[PDB]
């Protein structure tokens, strides 16, 4: 009944180092092992190691025994049975095949034959290893298009282009518009640039009472784009 | 008026207590005053001795103990006969304008000395001034007792005699003066006059005559 | 099974199973707490003696519950009352190897009085009926 | 420092006493100075003192009849006492005053006090309160055996307090005795001063007695001869 | 990975399916516990099975585990649309970390068909102003896990600048995909129309845009 | 798969509650001093070995401001004061008119005694200025300040006012949770928890403003408060390094025993032998300035980086503005100007000496009623105490807000002195009954 929030996605050149954090809440951080597991396209899911916040004893897989350093802070108590903590994993000598998604995971039981078993997982941290630099994205409006003339529904959105750092988030009306949102995965161009599209389906009659603003974020390039989608469509089926 | 007297044997240690007892932490001066001279500061700060004052004198320190201010004279001499004032200062009495009542120190047991007697007849100028006074000077006698008698020839003169009371001099010996005032016809009336002095020692006399 | 003794309340932070075996530690000090000699009561023993009686009144209150539950002489005893899933929906390994007795009491706190009613009625009040019938003949 | 007093020798009742004190060997500006007297049959009475700031403080027993002043241009201390009576007849000493501090605690709490101690004194000066006038002394020679003879001067009938007697200044200092005075029933005073002289020194040496009677206007020398 | 699972397995709606998990005796299960995880791509996994048969808290009784001396098995009964995903097994002890398997993708047969939704977007005027042109063919709501996309310039195929993504699963257990056609402004203006053709084994849909309007 | 409930007796489960604790202290014989009220005749024999048990993995919430041990200790010190004043002599006949003169606040006062022991007795004793007030105001007559408010009773001469260590214990079935966190805030969850049967040796040092002879906070000093933004609540501070304060009554006073009648004996202040020196307290300015600098470092931790001024007390009566305390038997009232006269911004020794007056009649804990006459202490007085804490108070309404902040000393309540040493202890009731389901069933009856 607790939440584990990991640090944001990062981009580090090969040969450099990176330290990922994992802040915990909703449970006694001292009572459960913190596991670190990664997933790459070349080797699939691979368990890296775990560390005990209570005793400090760490167990690393031999593949990560010489390049991973795990540390934990002291639990900041909240109530008698809950607290807040943080666990850190510092990985060095990064290579291209290390690009992937990393996860911190809470143990299963305090005692028994399977105490460290990863039970509660974080949302994941995306790590990109490449010699290329950070490129800011470009946002274009996707004009409204008809979805059902008899149903009176339309679809509008925003198109994102030319960005190298894969982590990109899109919201609508500062998070006030969540229904009908559909975000599509990104495309991998031959140049090494990633681009995606996002679209939302709304009634065609909603033109004079609702404002539609797409908010594009990009933590690596540290660029925010607030684009106003022009509701005037050019589709003949929607013009009717 | 009565002040205070003290008697001490020659050569021993005299202790003069202060007439006042301090109510608080004290500052006491001890002064020595001889007749006809300037007073001397013997002790200041209850325990400090000015330069030139012999170490035979000493005061009592204010160590917060219950001790009265005391002046100690070790090996007293006849030259220590004087009056000793205890000027007392303390924190509870205020500005002490009073020097207090000193205690006269009398040093006893010094050798008895024989008195010297000198008898002068009336001057020729005094006779031609229609007066006449016979002067009998007694000096250099250490014991205290005295008595001077005058005799016109063989009969004792009873009036016209004015004798000083004896007092010690700069040699610590006593001295007295006796004056018998006569008229020029009384002086030339008798064949002789005589000053006979009495001193717990023995009969002593001298004699003059008109010539 | 644990043979290490930690003292009174030493197994509060441990799991319920690791603490269910050391119940003799919290049972000896629960009752014994006596100021043996040297006491004068002057706005003290009135408060002190009542605190000592309130301890044995709640102690005998707990033994009264264990008396009507058929567990007067045992710390560990099993019953006939089935476990209602509405009380807690956790399995066996989730309770005795993950939670503590402190946080467990907070979860079942809402139904403690309900279970106490069924514990003195569903079994002991009804098992004594068949106990009279088994030794009847 | 050296102190020497000078006075009138005689004051009449209901008049103003005045004495002066010359200082030597030390500057008058950097010290406290005070006056003390002693009357016959009484003890030393502290009159008052002047500070280096030329501020004065007096014994209340004097009833504001006293006033003390400084004169740095002549390095002299001065004292006046108005409206005198016979009780004011005394020998008046001038003295230096040093201020000490006896502290028994915290200075800010007033747990201290001051005290004065006189360290240098003067021989004093005789001052009499009497209605009559100063009478000069008529002095006579007492003409002069164990190798020595007696040689005297009779100082007869002088009115107030002391008389200074010297003998050839410094030459005759070895064996001179000036006797204490006698009080005649007339109120007049008389003393005698004698010297012991070798009989061989008679007829060849000379001896005069210098009789100073400062209260009266007087000055006499007397050559004594057999 | 030395822990091998069945590469693929299929079951019908409302039926049961079994996934295998075996390997050498160095990783075998006689002396090691076996756990099972449901791991949807791009999302955090969820533990369903641990210590062989014992299931995780809150797991439905439809899931069961069984471990022989040469292999372990995971049985999923009463298959649902959400059960159609990737599954992994792991061998572990108490002091040694997890060793993941090769993975198994489960397909649920007997599901209803879901018509595809195609939408084609032309390049924006701001993009033509920037001297590029990209046609965006968005496609959603798919019954099968596969599509085939073709582009046409004036009813004739295109082969330069075509980039198509892999199919992705929607939150409603449907599928989705997208395709992009990069073009120069000359090719965009020199043709009467462009077309995106989405071909499925049951029906082929065609959407057409025109640079004239 | 069949789960049956199972009873467990002795489960580590506790709940907050308030109960009635008891005294604990070492058994010092003290044959020369007949049973001082804090050592008592016989309160307990303290356990030879103090026993504490760390409760690992246990977090618990503490609140020193809603604690019941403070309200208990406050009611116990008040009741112990009344039980110690009943058998002692009451000063009902002394209120006879007093003819007073100065010895300077200290004054001599003649009076005529009404005895029963031959009809009357003239006597005059040394009384301070605070104890008396004139009626004719022509200095002809005086009276005790208390003779128009309430009764007065002289404290017994055998009992001593020295605070000794007192341990507060919980009865059977109860436990005391001790927080051991170093940087422990006043209220909140404490990670390190250990249980004890009795608290540490707490000395009941009744003090105003600065806290004396207390416990020092470990590592960094601590700023504790119920509300820091709301001024109306006091501010308790606990230093790490204790400053030394040396107070003295240099007056070599003397005691004069006066018989009222059958058995009744009054102890009057005789004439003082020696000099009159008012009471004072040296506090080292260097280690006070160092301590003052460590306090402002942490006060600013809740008031931006730099905004603070130190002034003196300006509200209440004389018994609240002054540092009131006990030493040697006499109660001192010290002026605290020089300690709280500073200004800090932007983040030689001269031992500071405070003037202290003396009062022999007192009304502590805001007690309006039965009043105590402190008998005079013979001989000079000198005590050295370790000032360990302070009690401050904001001024409040400020237009500049962060522009300047001002902290004045105050002592609105005595319970703050118990809160400065009871912040770490808490009372709980052990509930040993726990029911949990297992796969075990009792032997079937059928
Ligand atoms: C809080 O702190 C403050 C300071 O921070 C403390 O204050 C102290 O309080 C005590 C007790 O009241 C004081 O003691 C008294 O000191 C008097 C001063 O004399 C000697 O001390 C000073 C240092 O304070 C030295 O400088 C002196 O020597 C120098 O000065 C003289 C004068 O210029 C020179 O001539 C010398 O050559 C030096 O250059 C002195 O040594 C002192 O008079 C006083 O009275 C007597 O007490 C004792 C015990 O009997 C004697 O030893 C002492 O000598 C005094 O005795 C009398 O006789 C001597 C000669 O023998 C004469 O000097 C006097 O007539 C004297 O009356 C007492 O000792 C202390 O001075 C003071 N310190 C400071 C720095 O202010 C507080 O105590 C403290 N609070 C507490 C609770 O402790
Ligand atoms: C206070 O709070 C924390 C909870 O956060 C508890 O810490 C847990 O303590 C339990 C009990 O000791 C631990 O569970 C144990 O796991 C061990 C696995 O660790 C192995 O590998 C590590 C490397 O990280 C080594 O340090 C360790 O020595 C082991 O080699 C098991 O060894 C334990 O028992 C296992 O083996 C025995 C036989 O040997 C079997 O009977 C068991 O069934 C089991 O297979 C045990 O399972 C848990 O890992 C700890 N977690 C953390 C995060 O530290 C404290 O216990 C708790 N209370 C107290 C009093 O401290
Ligand atoms: C604690 O110590 C302080 C520090 O000394 C002490 O404060 C002092 O109080 C007295 C009493 O008022 C002050 O004396 C004043 O002096 C000024 C001139 O310097 C006078 O003008 C004052 O008279 C006026 O004010 C009086 C009070 O308002 C009126 O009654 C009067 O009619 C005049 O209007 C007064 O005499 C002294 O100045 C201060 N100290 C300092 C350094 O200023 C204080 O009393 C001690 N006790 C406490 C605070 O309980
Ligand atoms: C109560 O009234 C009586 C009335 O006599 C007071 O007694 C008198 O006290 C004084 C001193 O204050 C005595 O005077 C002197 O005492 C000293 C002490 O040493 C002594 O040395 C003197 O010779 C002189 O006696 C006086 O004698 C004494 N009365 C009698 C009859 O002896 C008493 O002090 C008063 N008490 C109070 C507290 O007011
Ligand atoms: C301020 O607080 C500090 C912190 O304790 C005090 O330091 C200690 O002061 C005492 C007294 O000066 C020192 O004792 C002395 O020790 C030396 C030898 O070291 C000895 O020769 C002396 O006779 C005396 O006993 C002590 O060592 C010292 N401690 C440290 C660690 O420095 C300081 O005194 C306080 N000062 C003031 C003005 O408050
Ligand atoms: C305080 O006062 C007492 C009372 O006088 C002092 O004690 C006596 O002091 C004297 C001084 O010589 C001794 O002879 C006595 O033996 C002391 N005791 C008695 C019972 O008389 C004491 O010294 C004073 N001292 C201080 C520091 O206050
Ligand atoms: C015991 O059950 C009651 C009833 O549901 C709980 O009280 C409600 O708790 C919810 C949140 O859990 C609140 O939103 C409601 O306002 C509460 N009251 C009502 C009337 O619904 C209570 O929290 C439960 N206690 C425990 C310890 O589980
Ligand atoms: C209060 O006490 C004083 C002192 O005994 C009484 O009057 C004093 O009488 C003495 C007698 O020598 C005088 O020296 C004092 O000056 C007097 N006092 C004053 C203030 O002048 C006085 O009569 C007493 N009064 C009462 C009402 O008891
Ligand atoms: O934080 C305030 C102050 O507290 C005391 C500490 N000293 C020690 C020895 O712990 C100071 O360093 C600190 O500044
Ligand atoms: C007691 O009464 C008498 C009678 O008037 C009075 O003179 C005296 O001052 C009073 N006080 C004392 C202490 O004697
Ligand atoms: C008692 O005296 C005090 C002294 O100020 C006064 O305030 C009070 O009003 C008096 N008592 C009554 C009942 O008024
Ligand atoms: C926590 O507890 C341990 C042992 O009980 C003790 O050594 C340590 O000092 C404590 N630390 C804190 C911050 O309470
Ligand atoms: C410490 O406690 C006070 C009072 O509850 C609170 O206002 C303050 O925020 C706490 N400290 C911190 C760092 O939050
Ligand atoms: C202090 O009081 C203010 C005003 O009522 C309030 O807003 C604040 O929350 C309080 N803070 C604490 C710690 O009590
Ligand atoms: C407080 O400190 C911070 C960090 O050094 C600084 O940014 C800020 O400007 C400071 N504020 C003031 C008022 O000094
Ligand atoms: C504060 O102390 C200084 C000396 O450090 C002093 O001059 C000033 O008057 C004091 N101020 C107050 C209000 O006491
Ligand atoms: C800080 O205080 C000092 C000391 O008086 C003063 O000179 C300075 O101007 C003050 N600075 C500020 C910014 O208040
Ligand atoms: C008081 O301070 C002194 C001096 O540092 C120290 O020796 C003593 O242990 C301290 N006592 C207390 C109770 O703080
Ligand atoms: C507070 O400040 C404002 C201007 O900032 C001023 O008008 C007002 O009078 C001030 N109030 C007080 C009580 O000083
Ligand atoms: C309080 O903050 C204001 C900003 O509004 C600043 O100007 C002022 O300097 C601050 N006060 C300080 C630092 O004392
Ligand atoms: C300090 O005292 C002065 C004078 O009493 C007063 O005007 C000022 O407001 C005070 N400052 C504080 C912060 O208390």
Numbering used by the authors:
A (entry chain D): 1 to 52, 52A, 53 to 72, 72A, 72B, 72C, 72D, 72E, ...
B (entry chain L): 4 to 8, 11 to 66, 66A, 66B, 66C, 67 to 95, 95A, 95B, ...
C (entry chain B): 515 to 549, 563 to 664
D (entry chain H): 2 to 82, 82A, 82B, 82C, 83 to 100, 100A, 100B, 100C, ...
E (entry chain E): 2 to 214
F (entry chain G): 32 to 134, 152 to 165, 168C, 168D, 169 to 308, 311 to 321, 321A, 322 to 355, ...
From the primary publication:
The envelope glycoprotein (Env) of HIV-1 harbors the epitopes of all broadly neutralizing antibodies (bNAbs) (1) and is the main target of vaccine design (2). However, it was not until recently that the primary cause of Env metastability—an HR1 bend (residues 547 to 569) in gp41ECTO—was identified and targeted directly by rational redesign.
The clade B H078.14 gp140 construct was selected for crystallization screening, as the trimer structure for a tier 3 neutralization-resistant isolate had yet to be determined. A crystal structure was determined for the H078.14 UFO-BG trimer (tier 3, clade B) at a resolution of 4.6 Å, which explains how this neutralization-resistant virus evades apex bNAbs and enables antigenic optimization of this UFO-BG trimer. Crystallographic analysis at this moderate resolution thus confirmed that BG505 gp41ECTO of the UFO design, with a minimal level of metastability, can be used to stabilize diverse HIV-1 Envs in a prefusion state, in addition to providing the first structural model for a tier 3 neutralization-resistant Env spike. To this end, we superposed the apices of H078.14 UFO-BG and BG505 SOSIP trimer structures for visual inspection, which revealed a short insertion at the tip of the V2 hairpin, an additional N-linked glycan at position N171 (HXB2 numbering), and a shortened V2 loop. On the basis of the sequence alignment and the crystal structure, we identified two more residues in strand C that may have destabilized the V2 apex. The additional glycan at N171 may have little effect on apex bNAb binding as it points sideways in the crystal structure (left). Our analysis thus confirmed that H078.14 can evade apex bNAbs through mutations in strand C and surrounding loops.
